[PDB]
């Protein structure tokens, strides 16, 4: 493929490979005073719209758009189904700009048909921390694909980001663009296998009967780390230390403030779960996973897949293996059907012993306007929504 849009932009060409020692922007010495002050032109009968995520009604309009039009797997079994409460948590982190939540409406009908979002975060690439935008939730309605709207959405958000004197961005995708800094396979751990078979995702055979399948994915309902409990406000400082120390070994990761810690980890029902082990008034271990349901497309009996996604996990009092077994138990106790993770951080090493299956695709990590060595997913220490 040609990448007629992406080749205009400050990213790598497909054939670009840089040494471990090159770690700089593609275009340095940018200035806010030169950024375009006009909005990008939309085609006839479309308008830019500014979304207020904190208003139930606008938030529901985005929710409606994502429900019907977001990413489907290759085999169209599933469609991501971010909840309304989820979008509120993901779009209102500390210092979020309301102007970085960009909608597009069809004038004749007043209906949202397009969306792109960004929030600010500090990012450490190969030991240099940089102010960045994190881009998420790009979506064009199904009736309007392959009409070159995506680039308008990207250029527009780029423009508004540049106005805040920010010139770098991090994003993830299932698709291949120029060019990933890392590529990680996902892995699934069955919890309610009976459902995973009935919808057609998982398969039986003459060796693995229905009952043998259930027997194999059974977990013991007793935690290895006895005192593991839900995070509370008094745990923010201890979470900040533990996680700030652990993350420093990776090639790519976000630098968290106390404020971001409380925002990203304080538990919220059906959104984000965090557990901690506290001895001596000190936080020595933590487990976290987020809820991302999927719509199960065209199925008589089931409409929703309840899925937990591995977030950040750190142990100092047990093995990583034991910690994640406790994560899987904690997922099961909250009615999740499946536990998903990427081969990032220490995760790869436990997939075989804990009975994870290799999934069908992979998640690519990209930076905008950053030149650097690509690296294996073990060196990736950030998880994005
Ligand atoms: C300094 C600040 C920097 C800020 C900016 C940073 C960049 C952030 C970038 C955003 C990161 C998103 C992160 C994120 O949200 C997480 S990845 C999930 C994105 N969402 C979906 O997949 C939802 C369902 N699909 C859609 O809505 C459409 O397929 C979309 C709208 C994706 C494309 O609409 P369309 O109707 O299918 O296509 P056209 O309008 O005709 O446009 C075709 C052009 O779109 C390029 N394309 C396709 N998919 C892309 C993707 N996932 N990322 C980036 N680019 C993508 C494609 O390569 C082609 O360019 P080319 O001709 O060069 O090949
Ligand atoms: C039973 C186990 O399977 C699942 O839980 C599930 C649910 N909904 C999806 C919806 C779309 C999909 O397409 C491939 C894909 C496409 C993009 C993507 N991203 C992009 C950026 N944001 C989140 C992850 N992740 C996966 C796969 C899926 C999958 S499996 C593949 C990846 C995951 N999780
Ligand atoms: Cl227990
Ligand atoms: Mg289009």
Author numbering: 26 to 410
Please share text taken word for word from the publication where this structure appeared:
N-Myristoyltransferase (NMT, EC 2.3.1.97) catalyses the transfer of the fatty acid chain C14:0 from myristoyl coenzyme A (MyrCoA) to the N-terminal glycine residue of substrate proteins. This co- and post-translational modification is ubiquitous in eukaryotic organisms and plays a central role in a variety of cellular processes such as the addressing and reversible anchoring of proteins to membranes. In particular, NMT has been validated as a pharmacological target in fungal infections, in a range of parasitic diseases caused by Trypanosoma,7Leishmania8 and Plasmodium protozoa and filarial nematodes, and as a potential target for the treatment of cancer. Herein, we report the synthesis and the structure-guided optimization of a series of quinolines with balanced activity against both Plasmodium vivax and Plasmodium falciparum N-myristoyltransferase (NMT).
Crystal structures were determined of 26, in complex with first PvNMT to explore the basis of potency, and then with LmNMT, to allow comparison of its binding mode with that of 19 (S5 & S6‡). As expected, an ionic interaction is observed between the piperazine and the C-terminal leucine. This complex is further stabilized by direct and water-mediated H-bonds of the piperazine with Thr197 and Asn161. The pyridine ring also establishes a stabilizing polar interaction with the phenol of Tyr211. Finally, the role of the substituent located on position 6 of the quinoline ring was explored. The benzyloxy-present in all the above compounds sits at the top of a narrow cavity, which leads to the catalytic C-terminal leucine of N-myristoyltransferase. Virtually all of the known families of NMT inhibitors interact with the C-terminal residue, which is a leucine in fungi, Plasmodium and Leishmania but is a valine in T. brucei and a glutamine in human NMTs. This interaction is usually formed by an amino group in the inhibitor that establishes a strong ionic bond with the C-terminal NMT carboxylate.
